[PDB]
Nucleic acid binder design. Structure first.
Lengths: 87, 77, 100, 98, 387, 81, 70, 65
RNA sequence: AAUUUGAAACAAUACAGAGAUGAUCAGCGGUUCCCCUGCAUAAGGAGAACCGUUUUACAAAGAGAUUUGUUUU
């Protein structure tokens, strides 16, 4: 009967090699392919898009940079991980 | 582990290091530690993007506090 | 050793990181300077008696002698521990062109 | 664990007259009485420097200062052996990461 | 009766220890290990240079006798181009005592070197339970070398100390000069008045209990006009001292005295350290620092000597040095908190016995010891599917 | 071979004049006597510089001091003048 | 420790976060460090017009400042 | 002594001002050694329980009692 | 179960290996736990950590209670 549980770090593991959107505490997010992470959820992303986000209108978002290669994004400011990315 | 292997294979490459303050540093990564402290040679300083007004050009190594580091990424541009 | 022992059950002045002074009596403290205090008031209507101040928010405890002497109100109003200026980058580009 | 360096450094300055400048812009002249592992300072016989513009104290002779609120500690050159500081420093960074 | 199965444990030692002679100059401790580890589990390997530095000796202590035998089957094998010899190490062990308190293993190796004797192994005792322990076992390479070391080194004066060098045999051990205290025959009498600090009066007052071997009155008690004085009294047998303890809480003259069996020094130092480790005061603790991690073989004289020769500290700046082997460290108590703080700064990360050591408070020493001990929808769909 | 950490490389600058940029639009220049892994620093013969914005003109003031301890959490970057 | 999330293990909760963000969603799972798995996630910034949809998400336990029923 | 006072404070009315200047008014039901709370019957400035991350507390006004 | 002082720990330091020890770093009563001898179970072996209990010369004074993810913005 009782259908099994989802464990957060396990979801993040299941997101390795998929697209992910990492949203920080500020109005900023990084979309990219998740390469890996460590104990503290420092994340390695590949070919990341960096967005500043407009609170009222999601269209007036600002692409700050197109990254190439890998970046280490420190898990200090990381609020939300969305597997598969935006919409 | 994925992170320590990343640190190993980005020594010597050109990177961008963005602080929490939004300051952006570009140059050659001379050193990095586990705490994301960074040393960079030939660093330029811009706010948010390399395309914005130049704030500083540095002529020796710049050291940056890992506690203040938001990201480090390879530069390929 | 620097403990807040000597200040127990004595009148104290507290500055919180927000930039607010407090007159109080420090009934208790922990090793995170979490202030247990009573008969607190500003600097100047009594707010209360008995509150917990969290150590993270404490900037400064001062030991005072007598409660009167003193009062004040025409002072530039003290700041916070944060130095979130505003458009720091604007200031840095101004400094760049200033050095050009 | 590590740190130690500046903890020991301050233990050498106990009973020296220093000036502590804070993140709030307040400057405090005083006599160093104690320091702890977080570099919290207990100053005796204090007086606000720059100007008593910050009267908020006046009736305060000895203060405890939360280490995390300090911005600067001004000292005199007479008080420090710069050889010990450079040597200790090279040994310490060596220690914290090895 | 308790019996001498000391000869048992010594036979075990020799029996499972081998001497390898004539290894190549290039052979290090590790290569000795690899060559012999097929012989049996190995407890220890020592390597030493020959006199003219043309080859090496090795000592191998095996776990069990079959391993020593297997090692001995390698005699007359060829290593590199060197023909080695493997034999039981026997009647080649010295016991040495009363070298100067500041002698090191290197000093002892060089001592034997000066008379052209190779030392293969120098074994020093743990200071865990007695900080003052000071003797050594030394394995050399031949029975003759042992006899030469006894002839030349026993009675030699080194830094004012009359050296003792013996062919090792524990059954022949000397009776210690403090044996009376160790045997529980020495009482300490405390809270005497100055009027009462008189050997004659004490003999009349205590001799009823048994023959008195000795009375010692610590100097300086009358000269400094003490309120309370102490005296020590050694009786020839334990029964006499025990019965003399009945004078405790009794009246002597016009004073009330305490009488107890004298404690021994290693005991007293450990209680001082126990007192220190549990302390929550601060004037005393702020005058001391800790050094760690250290071998339990390192004596205070070596640490003091280290401070003088390597750190250039004045002898009178050090009040006391105490060992703390339960945290692999040592405590140095200085003359002021500022000097202690400065030594703390200077010493952290320095090298002692070739290893980097750290300094800190007692709680620091304890802490260090304890620490060493794709598509959003797709993902949603799997989970939803389970539901 | 090996791994110089950024801290180790910075300790190569010990006893030399460094430039430090601090939070709150302030910079110091001085001779670096010490630092730890939190970037606490002792500077000798230091010069602080406070930068402010009056409406649309940049203004500055300066302080100078013999010997100054600096809490690491105010430090944003270190380089040479 | 103090709050057993199991009682909250399948209803919509309201979660305030450190940088000002407010998030509402159905609690699917969690750990001891209070990392959370939320479904039907809505992210609000600082009323209703400031709304973004995020779907399935993980909120990092390190920045959580308050939790309640919704 | 302070967290001790919170432990015994279990069941008291309380007002909690957080770092975000919001207010909480409720009846303490549990604290832990890190100062996190859960509180009964709550007003944000409607809820029945609430969990408050101790790092996000500015201070707690207790009852004069 | 605490500190300081009276208060002097003498007697030449050393004087037999982790082969050392006085709760000096212990004995005993219990709880839990890391592996083996082994299919099992069950002797027993290598034990670790927490909690009861068994030890301390006298005096006086003053009185240590701080208790073993908040401080690198």
């Amino acid at each position: 009967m009782s259908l099994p549980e989802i464990l957060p770090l396990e979801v993040i593991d299941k997101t390795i090699n998929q697209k992910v959107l990492i949203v920080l505490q500020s109005n900023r997010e990084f979309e990219g392919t998740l390469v890996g992470f460590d104990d503290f959820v420092n994340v390695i992303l590949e070919d990341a898009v960096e967005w500043l986000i407009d609170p009222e209108d999601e269209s007036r978002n600002e692409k700050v940079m197109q990254h190439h290669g890998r970046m280490l994004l420190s898990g200090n400011n990381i609020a939300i991980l969305v597997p598969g990315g935006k919409k | 582990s994925v992170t320590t292997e990343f640190l190993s294979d980005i020594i010597g490459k050109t990177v961008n290091v963005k602080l929490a303050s939004g300051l952006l540093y570009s140059g050659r990564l001379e050193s990095i530690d586990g705490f994301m402290n960074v040393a960079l040679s030939s660093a330029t300083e811009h706010y948010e993007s390399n395309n914005n007004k130049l704030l500083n050009k540095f002529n020796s190594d710049v050291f940056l506090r890992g506690t203040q580091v938001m990201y480090i990424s390879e530069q390929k541009i | 050793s620097a403990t807040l022992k000597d200040y127990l059950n004595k009148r104290v002045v507290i500055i919180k990181v927000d930039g607010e002074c407090l007159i109080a009596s420090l009934n208790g403290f922990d090793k995170n300077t979490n202030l247990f205090i009573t008969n607190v008031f500003n600097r100047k209507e009594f707010i209360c008696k008995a509150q917990l101040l969290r150590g993270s928010e404490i900037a400064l405890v001062g030991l005072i002698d007598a409660l009167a002497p003193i009062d004040e109100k025409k002072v530039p109003m003290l700041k916070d521990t944060k130095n979130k200026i505003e458009n720091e980058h604007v200031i840095w580009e101004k400094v760049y062109e200033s050095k050009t | 664990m590590g740190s130690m360096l500046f903890f020991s450094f301050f233990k050498t300055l106990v009973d020296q007259e220093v000036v502590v400048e804070l993140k709030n812009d307040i400057e405090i002249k005083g006599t160093l009485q104690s320091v702890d592992q977080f570099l919290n300072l207990k100053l005796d016989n204090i007086s606000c420097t720059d100007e008593k513009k910050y009267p908020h104290l006046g009736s305060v002779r000895n203060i405890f200062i939360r280490g995390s609120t300090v911005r600067y500690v001004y000292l005199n050159k007479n008080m420090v052996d710069t050889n010990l500081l450079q040597d200790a420093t090279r040994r310490e960074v060596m220690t914290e990461r090895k | 009766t308790s019996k001498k199965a000391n000869e048992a444990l010594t036979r075990n030692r020799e029996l499972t220890t081998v001497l390898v002679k004539n290894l190549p100059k290039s052979y290090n401790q590790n290569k000795v290990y690899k060559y012999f580890k097929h012989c049996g589990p190995i407890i220890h390997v020592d390597v030493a240079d020959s006199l003219k530095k043309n080859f090496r000796f090795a000592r191998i202590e095996f776990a069990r006798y079959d391993g020593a035998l297997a090692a001995i089957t390698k005699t007359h094998k060829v290593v590199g181009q060197n023909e080695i010899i493997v034999s039981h190490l026997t009647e080649c062990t010295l016991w040495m005592t009363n070298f100067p308190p500041s002698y090191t293993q290197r000093n002892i190796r060089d001592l034997l070197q000066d008379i052209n004797v190779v030392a293969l192994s120098i074994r020093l005792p743990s200071l865990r339970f007695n900080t003052s322990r000071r003797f050594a076992y030394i394995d050399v390479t031949s029975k003759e070398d042992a006899r030469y070391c006894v002839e030349k080194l026993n009675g030699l004066k080194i830094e004012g100390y009359t050296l003792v060098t013996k062919v090792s045999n524990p059954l022949e051990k000397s009776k210690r000069t403090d044996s009376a205290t160790l045997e529980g025959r020495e009482i300490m009498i405390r809270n005497l008045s100055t009027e009462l600090l008189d050997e004659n009066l004490l003999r009349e007052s205590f001799e009823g209990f048994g023959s008195i071997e000795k009375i010692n009155i610590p100097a300086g008690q009358k000269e400094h006009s003490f309120n309370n004085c102490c005296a020590f009294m050694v009786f020839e047998n334990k029964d006499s001292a025990e019965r003399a303890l009945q004078m405790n809480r009794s009246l002597l003259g016009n004073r009330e005295i305490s009488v107890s069996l004298a404690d021994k020094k290693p005991f007293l130092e450990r209680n001082e350290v126990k007192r220190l480790l549990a302390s929550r005061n601060s004037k005393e603790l702020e005058t001391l620092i800790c050094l760690f991690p250290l071998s339990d073989k390192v004596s205070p004289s070596l640490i003091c000597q280290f401070l003088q020769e390597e750190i250039h500290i004045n002898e009178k700046d050090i009040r006391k040095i105490l060992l703390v082997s339960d945290f692999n460290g040592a405590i140095i108590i200085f003359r002021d908190s500022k000097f202690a703080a400065k030594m703390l700064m200077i010493l952290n990360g320095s090298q002692f016995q070739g290893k980097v050591i750290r300094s800190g408070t007692i709680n620091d020493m304890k802490r260090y010891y304890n620490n060493q001990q794709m598509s959003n929808d797709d993902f949603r769909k799997m989970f939803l599917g389970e539901l | 071979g090996s791994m110089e950490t950024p801290l180790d490389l910075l300790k190569l600058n010990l006893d030399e004049r460094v430039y430090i940029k601090l939070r709150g639009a302030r910079t110091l220049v001085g001779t670096l006597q010490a630092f730890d892994s939190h970037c606490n620093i002792v500077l000798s013969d230091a010069v602080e510089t406070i930068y402010q914005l009056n409406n649309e003109e940049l203004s500055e003031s300066e302080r100078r001091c013999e010997m100054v301890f600096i809490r690491g959490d105010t430090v944003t970057l270190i380089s040479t003048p | 420790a103090i709050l057993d999330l199991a009682k909250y293990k399948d209803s919509k909760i309201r979660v305030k976060l450190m940088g000002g963000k407010l998030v509402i969603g159905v609690l699917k799972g969690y750990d001891q460090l209070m990392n959370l798995v939320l479904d039907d996630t809505v992210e609000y910034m600082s009323i209703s017009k400031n709304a973004r949809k995020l779907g399935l998400t993980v909120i990092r336990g390190t920045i959580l400042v308050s939790l309640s029923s919704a | 002594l302070p967290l001790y006072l919170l432990t015994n404070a279990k069941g008291q009315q309380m007002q909690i001002e957080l770092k975000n200047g919001e207010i909480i008014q409720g009846i303490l039901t549990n604290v832990d050694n890190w100062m996190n709370l859960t509180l009964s019957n709550v007003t944000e400035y409607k809820l029945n329980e609430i969990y408050i991350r101790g790092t996000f507390i500015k201070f707690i006004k207790l009852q004069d009692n």
